[PDB]
DNA sequence: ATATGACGCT
DNA sequence: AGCGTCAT
């Protein structure tokens, strides 16, 4: 009763880029704009596989993952745009360029954790309580929030989705109590609000559109993020979350898409994620773990409480290339000429890093996949990070993997080598 | 033949 | 330290 927490102490944001990296390639080739469009990598085998989708395109059922010569299947009219390759490798500095613009432009309203490349949680606690004082408790007219769905509305006593999002937005703000400035739906509405402006501004700005969720925590508000995308916003509030969570597959939840989930679905004999709040803290974590167990019991009642950490930076910087089927690595020859190129991409990046946000990355981790293994790294090595050389980090890379060539040959590497992948770790401030 | 980032477990 | 998980 008077002492049960309901995880409404945070207003948290989630905005996530639409179609991210085909937006990039529209901005820069107008060509582009408004057709069934996607990004590629590599073009030899099928056409190259596809990595982001225009919503004009999802619309005939391309999707990420797919060859683009299937997806030319599907859609006969796809226009494509091919990620810069470069040392014989994908390079995606075009998109992490465009990732810092729309990052630094979030970072003026609040603090910002960056969960992607596309994506970030803002914690926007504090700017609401500051625009509730600002706002002299005066109504919020449905003109602050032109983009903004409420989920869960409208409800009880239109045929198209802008009247059908109106009438739920009605409904919300002539159910608001605007004089109570602790009120948690009042919070969420004003952090929506903000949103709203933050959206405004990344589009005027970069050219770039978005969605986000807002909500209480990171769980709900990556939820909402989904739920209306493109160009949309959604606000989830405390009280929709028992409809919401009652026919709402498990494996949705950020986390539960993959084992646990299964294993949650599995053990208990559920689908969705209401259904886990029948069950006892000690019988969730009996199952799962005490972390999990803990996790799954609250976040079923829609609470959570992972903070929105302050890092607007990635915490590694890392190069890798995988070499699938007959291109896998087979000689020494190839596999120190690959450890080369993308030592030569690292530095470059590490370089341009110290400069850009003086710190240096300490160490180097070097990871690779061997033919037949079906995990994402086979094996793990590390050695120190000294100096931002490309040739210094290569020739280390293969000192600390070379006694994983089981071959009797000098000049073969066996088993062959699908993966590598260099990690520059544990940066220091310099 | 579906690049690379954060983080948990031991 | 090195491996496993989940993710975009
Ligand atoms: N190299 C590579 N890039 C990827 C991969 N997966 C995603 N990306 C890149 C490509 C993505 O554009 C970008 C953002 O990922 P999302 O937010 O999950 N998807 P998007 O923004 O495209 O569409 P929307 O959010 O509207 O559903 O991350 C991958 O597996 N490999
Ligand atoms: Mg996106
Ligand atoms: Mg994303």
Redesign the pocket.
């Given at each position: 009763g008077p002492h049960m927490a309901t995880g409404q102490d945070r207003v948290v944001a989630l905005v996530?880029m639409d179609c991210?990296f085909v937006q990039v390639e529209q901005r820069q080739n107008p060509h582009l704009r408004n057709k069934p469009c996607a990004v590629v990598?590599?073009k030899?085998?099928?056409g190259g596989?596809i990595?982001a989708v225009s919503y004009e395109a999802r619309a005939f059922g391309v999707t990420?993952?797919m060859?683009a010569d299937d997806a030319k299947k599907l859609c006969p009219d796809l226009l494509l745009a091919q990620?810069r390759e470069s040392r014989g490798?994908?390079?995606?500095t075009k998109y992490?360029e465009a990732s810092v613009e729309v990052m630094e432009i979030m970072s003026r309203f609040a603090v910002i954790?960056?969960?992607?490349?596309?994506?970030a949680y803002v914690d926007l606690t504090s700017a609401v309580q500051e625009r509730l004082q600002k706002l002299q408790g005066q109504p919020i007219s449905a003109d602050l929030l032109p983009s903004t769905y409420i989920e869960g509305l409208p409800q009880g006593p239109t045929v198209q989705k802008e009247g059908m999002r109106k009438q739920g937005l009605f409904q919300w703000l002539d159910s608001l109590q605007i004089d109570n400035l602790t009120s948690p739906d009042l919070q969420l509405t004003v952090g929506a609000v903000i949103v709203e402006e933050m959206r405004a501004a990344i589009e005027r700005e970069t050219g770039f559109q978005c969605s986000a969720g807002i909500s209480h925590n990171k769980v709900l508000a990556?939820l909402a993020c989904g739920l209306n995308k493109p160009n949309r916003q959604t606000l989830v509030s405390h009280g929709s979350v028992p409809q919401l969570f009652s026919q709402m597959p498990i494996?949705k939840?950020?986390?539960?898409?993959?084992?646990?989930?299964?294993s949650v679905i599995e053990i208990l004999g559920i689908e969705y994620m209401g259904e886990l709040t029948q069950f006892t803290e000690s019988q969730l974590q009996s199952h799962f773990?005490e972390?999990?167990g803990s996790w799954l019991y609250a976040m079923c009642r829609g609470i959570e409480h992972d903070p929105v950490?302050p890092?607007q930076?990635?915490?590694?910087?890392?190069?890798?290339?995988?070499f699938?089927?007959?291109?896998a690595l087979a000689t020494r020859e190839q596999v120190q000429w690959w450890l080369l190129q993308?030592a030569q991409?690292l530095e470059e990046?590490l370089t341009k890093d110290r400069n850009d946000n003086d710190r240096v990355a300490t160490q180097l981790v070097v990871?690779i996949r061997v033919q037949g293994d079906k995990?994402?790294?086979?094996?793990?090595?590390?050695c120190a990070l000294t100096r931002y050389d490309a040739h210094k980090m290569s020739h280390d890379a293969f000192t600390?993997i070379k006694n994983c060539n089981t071959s009797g040959i000098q000049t073969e590497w066996s088993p062959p080598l699908?993966?590598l992948?260099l990690?520059a770790?544990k940066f220091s401030a310099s």
């Open positions: 996530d991210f990598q590599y030899s085998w099928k596989g990595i990420r993952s060859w990620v490798k994908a390079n995606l992490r954790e960056r969960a992607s490349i596309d994506e990556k494996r939840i950020r986390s539960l898409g993959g084992k646990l989930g299964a773990g972390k999990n950490k890092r930076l990635p915490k590694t910087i890392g190069c890798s290339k995988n699938p089927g007959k291109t993308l991409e990046r990871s995990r994402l790294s086979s094996l793990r090595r590390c600390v699908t993966m992948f990690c770790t």
